Design a protein around this motif. Structure first.
Motif, PDB file in Angstrom:
ATOM      1  N   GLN A 147       0.812  -1.172   0.000  1.00 40.53           N
ATOM      2  CA  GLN A 147       0.000   0.000   0.000  1.00 40.53           C
ATOM      3  C   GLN A 147       0.868   1.254   0.000  1.00 40.53           C
ATOM      4  O   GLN A 147       1.406   1.672   1.056  1.00 40.53           O
ATOM      5  N   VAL A 148       1.052   1.850  -1.181  1.00 43.39           N
ATOM      6  CA  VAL A 148       1.985   2.948  -1.394  1.00 43.39           C
ATOM      7  C   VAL A 148       1.257   4.245  -1.320  1.00 43.39           C
ATOM      8  O   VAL A 148       0.319   4.462  -2.108  1.00 43.39           O
ATOM      9  N   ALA A 149       1.667   5.172  -0.465  1.00 44.30           N
ATOM     10  CA  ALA A 149       0.981   6.450  -0.284  1.00 44.30           C
ATOM     11  C   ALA A 149       1.524   7.597  -1.098  1.00 44.30           C
ATOM     12  O   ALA A 149       2.763   7.614  -1.370  1.00 44.30           O
ATOM     13  N   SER A 150       0.685   8.579  -1.371  1.00 48.27           N
ATOM     14  CA  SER A 150       1.084   9.850  -2.033  1.00 48.27           C
ATOM     15  C   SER A 150       0.346  10.975  -1.393  1.00 48.27           C
ATOM     16  O   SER A 150      -0.892  10.822  -1.206  1.00 48.27           O
ATOM     17  N   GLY A 151       0.945  12.107  -1.071  1.00 50.02           N
ATOM     18  CA  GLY A 151       0.288  13.249  -0.506  1.00 50.02           C
ATOM     19  C   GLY A 151       0.973  13.783   0.682  1.00 50.02           C
ATOM     20  O   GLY A 151       2.183  13.933   0.667  1.00 50.02           O
ATOM     21  N   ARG A 152       0.253  14.210   1.675  1.00 46.74           N
ATOM     22  CA  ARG A 152       0.800  14.718   2.913  1.00 46.74           C
ATOM     23  C   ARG A 152       0.264  13.817   4.039  1.00 46.74           C
ATOM     24  O   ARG A 152      -0.715  13.097   3.873  1.00 46.74           O
ATOM     25  N   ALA A 153       0.860  13.908   5.202  1.00 46.02           N
ATOM     26  CA  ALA A 153       0.613  12.952   6.281  1.00 46.02           C
ATOM     27  C   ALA A 153      -0.817  12.846   6.639  1.00 46.02           C
ATOM     28  O   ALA A 153      -1.188  11.668   6.940  1.00 46.02           O
ATOM     29  N   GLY A 154      -1.549  13.876   6.644  1.00 50.04           N
ATOM     30  CA  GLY A 154      -2.950  13.842   6.986  1.00 50.04           C
ATOM     31  C   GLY A 154      -3.936  13.741   5.860  1.00 50.04           C
ATOM     32  O   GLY A 154      -5.161  13.702   6.099  1.00 50.04           O
ATOM     33  N   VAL A 155      -3.503  13.878   4.608  1.00 47.63           N
ATOM     34  CA  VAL A 155      -4.355  13.857   3.410  1.00 47.63           C
ATOM     35  C   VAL A 155      -3.640  13.176   2.326  1.00 47.63           C
ATOM     36  O   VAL A 155      -2.665  13.753   1.711  1.00 47.63           O
ATOM     37  N   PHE A 156      -3.889  11.894   2.071  1.00 52.57           N
ATOM     38  CA  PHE A 156      -3.116  11.115   1.122  1.00 52.57           C
ATOM     39  C   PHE A 156      -3.955  10.101   0.431  1.00 52.57           C
ATOM     40  O   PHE A 156      -5.085   9.783   0.898  1.00 52.57           O
ATOM     41  N   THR A 157      -3.508   9.622  -0.717  1.00 57.63           N
ATOM     42  CA  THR A 157      -4.094   8.438  -1.331  1.00 57.63           C
ATOM     43  C   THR A 157      -3.139   7.321  -1.243  1.00 57.63           C
ATOM     44  O   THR A 157      -1.947   7.493  -1.004  1.00 57.63           O
TER      45      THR A 157
END
Ligand SMILES: O=C(O)CNC(=O)C(=O)O
Ligand SMILES: [Mg+2]
Ligand code: NI
Ligand SMILES: [Zn+2]
Length: 331
Positions: free
Chosen positions: A67-77
């Protein structure tokens, strides 16, 4: 009106009350439990799901998902990268390795703080959505493979007989594995039993306030929202409790431990994360009260959401105007 603040309720049914599943759901609703979107059910002390979990290591996780995230710590996909197959014993060893194991922590609150600070910087591997069950066939009460089917409920309420089946799914988790903000397919209920291992923390928005979460999500994920008028059906977006509070979105949180059931109610948006290696079982179900939610459920037609065989009939019968567009999205 029962539970007007939409708090998460916790129930302790007796062994007698644990016999009739439908009746107990209706009881919880009589007390206002559904207003929260989520309830916890602690089984009677006499009950057990199965005898032991000593023999599960040979279950196969055909397609573990990183599960790879993109965005900022509190708002990401997050996107799901497929990995090579592995057994549950292999996955357990991976979860407990230095790279993936739960860090030292003081309590659930400290661990929650660490999750939201650091999630995006790691890519945990989730064994999700595995058809199967860990309930013993001899467990008669709250056995998630022996529930009344949604097809039968639709037939009982509305008279129409439909194709499709309704079976449970297993989830093998590790630290930081994440479930994105969503409601169920067709705004169904879900029930989730944590068979073993470390906890699962849940966040939930009351059904009466779900559109507030949708409006925030459109603001926070503006490209995704242009792509699809129901992009939360894609099950990729995360928003932290701090961001929710900054934006005035009503929500609640609770931690589920091994041996506990959680029920999500129609149109109750939820999200959460696993504390460490665990195994959960979950299935969708319906009651008479669901039908009106099913008729009004949003739908993704952009192609992304792609779902089970059995959703076809639900759309076809409950939402005939939307059916042709939705089915194109399936094809
Ligand atoms: O446990 C998970 O990863 C996600 N589960 C659910 O969204 C559920 O039971 O409805
Ligand atoms: Mg096995
Ligand atoms: Ni869910
Ligand atoms: Zn879509």
């Amino acid at each position: 009106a029962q539970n007007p603040n939409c708090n998460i309720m916790i129930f302790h049914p007796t062994k007698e009350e644990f016999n009739d599943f439908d009746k107990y759901i209706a009881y919880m609703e009589s007390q206002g439990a559904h207003r929260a979107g989520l309830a916890k059910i602690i089984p009677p002390k006499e009950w057990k799901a199965r005898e032991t979990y000593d023999n599960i290591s040979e279950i196969l996780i055909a397609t573990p998902l990183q599960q790879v995230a993109s965005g900022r710590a509190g708002v990401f996909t997050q996107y799901h990268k497929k990995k090579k197959a592995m057994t549950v014993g292999e996955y357990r060893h991976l979860a407990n390795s230095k790279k993936y194991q739960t860090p030292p922590h003081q309590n659930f609150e400290d661990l929650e703080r660490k999750y939201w600070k650091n999630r995006i910087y790691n890519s945990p591997i989730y064994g999700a959505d595995i058809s199967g069950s860990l309930f013993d066939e001899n467990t008669k009460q709250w056995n998630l493979g022996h529930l009344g089917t949604i097809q039968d409920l639709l037939e009982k309420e509305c008279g129409v007989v439909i194709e499709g089946v309704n079976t449970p799914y297993l989830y093998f988790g590790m630290w930081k594995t994440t479930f994105a903000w969503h409601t169920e397919d067709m705004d169904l209920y879900s029930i989730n039993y944590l068979h073993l291992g470390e906890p699962k923390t849940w966040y939930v928005v009351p059904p009466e306030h779900g559109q507030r979460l949708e409006r925030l999500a459109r603001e926070l994920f503006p490209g995704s929202s242009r792509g699809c008028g129901a992009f939360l059906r894609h099950k990729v977006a995360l928003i932290s409790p701090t961001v929710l509070k900054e934006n005035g979105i009503p929500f609640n949180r609770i931690t589920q431990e091994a041996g506990e059931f959680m029920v999500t109610f129609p149109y109750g948006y939820h999200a959460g994360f696993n504390h460490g290696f665990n195994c959960a079982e979950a299935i969708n179900f319906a009651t008479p009260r669901w039908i009106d939610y099913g008729k009004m459920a949003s739908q993704c037609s952009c192609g992304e959401a792609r779902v089970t065989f059995s959703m076809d009939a639900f759309v076809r019968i409950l939402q005939p105007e939307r059916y042709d567009l939705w089915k194109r999205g399936q094809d």
